[PDB]
Amino acid sequence: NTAYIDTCYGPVADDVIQRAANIRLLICDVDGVMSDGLIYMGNQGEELKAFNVRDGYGIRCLITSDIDVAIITGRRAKLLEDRANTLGITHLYQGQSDKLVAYHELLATLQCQPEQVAYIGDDLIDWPVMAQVGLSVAVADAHPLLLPKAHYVTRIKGGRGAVREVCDLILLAQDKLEGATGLSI
């Protein structure tokens, strides 16, 4: 007889709400989480990535509500530094093959406990970190093997507002949703 709470994305288990209430740091993977997993490449070496505006708003709400937001990704691109800058994200880790290193560095840097960390991932590479945190999240269309492992599976797909969904959940859990705002720096 699990207890659930209605949210604007559907019912969420009380255990998940309780985990979300302790979050002081949200860590996000990029490709497949903030985007639908696509990398656009051109003939003169151009590269584009598509980000979702609604996720941006969620990220700003967290940051303005004293909840740190960090990024850990295996890829490396100037465009992501630009994106992080527009969102006010100062903790960006690119070109990371082993995500635990960046994760442990964040814990020490921010003097945060693992139970105070939420992590949104989409592939197996994310699991070693997700296995240790207070709130592990797999996006709706994450690799099938990651889905049953996470504390929460988002209703929204990667690149369509899965990050916003987790931002909304964390703020709801901490009774900060009604008053939160996400204006730019």
| Residue 160, both tokens | 């369509």
Identify the burial level of 166 via C-beta atoms within 10 angstroms of its C-beta, where 0-12 means exposed, 13-18 middle and 19 or more buried: buried
* Contact flag: residue 183 with Cl ion (CB under 5 A): no
User: Which residue's CB is nearer to a copy of itself, number 3 or number 10?
Assistant: 10
User: Which residue's CB is nearer to Cl ion, number 56 or number 161?
Assistant: 56
* Contact flag: residue 175 with a copy of itself (CB under 8 A): no
Q: Binds 68, which of a copy of itself, Cl ion, none (CB < 5 to 8 A, cut-off by type)?
A: none
Among candidates 148, 150, 174, which has minimal Cα distance to 20?
A: 174
x/- map, 59-98, a copy of itself, by CB under 8 A: ---------------xx-xxx--xx-------------x-
Distances (CA, A) of 90 to 29, 68, 80: 15, 9, 12
Buried b (16+ CB within 10 A) or exposed e, 106-132: bbeeeebeeebbbbbbbbebbbebbeb
The correct pick among 24, 28, 122, 152 for binding a copy of itself (CB under 8 A) is 122
| Residue 58, both tokens | 């969620």
Rounded CA separation 162/96 (Å): 22
Q: Binds 164, which of a copy of itself, Cl ion, none (CB < 5 to 8 A, cut-off by type)?
A: a copy of itself
x/- map, 49-68, Cl ion, by CB under 5 A: ----x--x------------
Where do contacts with Cl ion occur on this chain (CB under 5 A)? 53, 56
Q: Could you list the residues that contact a copy of itself (CB under 8 A)?
A: 8-9, 29, 31-32, 37-54, 57, 74-75, 77-79, 82-83, 97, 122-125, 141, 143-145, 159-161, 164, 182-185
